[PDB]
Amino acid sequence: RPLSELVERGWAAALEPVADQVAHMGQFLRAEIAAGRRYLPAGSNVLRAFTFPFDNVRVLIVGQDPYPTPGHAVGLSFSVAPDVRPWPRSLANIFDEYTADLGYPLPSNGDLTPWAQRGVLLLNRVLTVRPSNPASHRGKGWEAVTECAIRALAARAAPLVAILWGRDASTLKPMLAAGNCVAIESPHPSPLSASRGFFGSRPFSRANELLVGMGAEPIDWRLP
């Protein structure tokens, strides 16, 4: 399939250099199913972050790998469907930092689509996972795809702030070395890393200050 059937057109053009790799991934995923190994999120959600316009991305959030529990991952990093409770621990931790930083009430639900509609790309370094097996698709080929995505964003040379959560930060910063790009890092919001530096990192206000510094408009982070 042409990438234009799977992703928004700006993203299809940006990712055309890795189109074969995306096709390779689809073959991998189908072979996993044939071998009895499922993946998450749903196939139609794998590339969901790339269905919001490439040309509108102002903030890139980059996590590690999708939630491994069935019913959680939706193809926007960290997000869940609006009916999901309890929220996953990483998301609950994100929302505590959100209230600490911004002073807003806790969100009504775990659905981050408003951020995606507002120019926040909710990416992961690796775009699939086998259920119950954290990080199990590492090294399977997503990395080249997400490197192309990140570099293509950087190459726009439009104001961009990248928020890097977790162990990929040192790998990803060189990909964001470009005019009008700034990368800020912390430990990941997961259960056993959040209290080692995620909390207190204030990414939402920081990203807005960095955007304004560059002459861009800040993100309205307010969730319903």
Ligand X SMILES: O=c1[nH]cc(F)c(=O)[nH]1
Among 54, 77, 98, 152, binds ligand X (CB under 6 A): 77
On whether the CB atoms of residues 88 and 67 are closer than 8 A, the answer is yes
On whether the CB atoms of residues 91 and 78 are closer than 8 A, the answer is yes
| 208 lies in the binding site for ligand X (CB under 6 A) | no
| 119 lies in the binding site for Cl ion (CB under 5 A) | no
Fill in the per-residue mask, 19 to 58: x = in contact with ligand X (CB under 6 A), - = not in contact. ----------------------------------------
Distance (Å, whole) CA 124 – CA 219: 20
**Contacted by 89, from ligand X, Cl ion, none: CB < 5 to 8 Å by type:** Cl ion
Residue closer to Cl ion, measured from CB, 159 or 166: 166
User: Among this protein's residues, is 101 annotated catalytic?
Assistant: no
CA dist 29 to 8, 40, 88, 136, 169, Å? 21, 10, 25, 12, 26
63 DSSP 8-state letter: E
| 67 lies in the binding site for ligand X (CB under 6 A) | yes
């002073």: which residue's tokens? 103
| 88 lies in the binding site for Cl ion (CB under 5 A) | yes
């995505």: which residue's tokens? 149
Query: Nearest residue to ligand X, using CB?
Result: 63
| 115 lies in the binding site for ligand X (CB under 6 A) | no
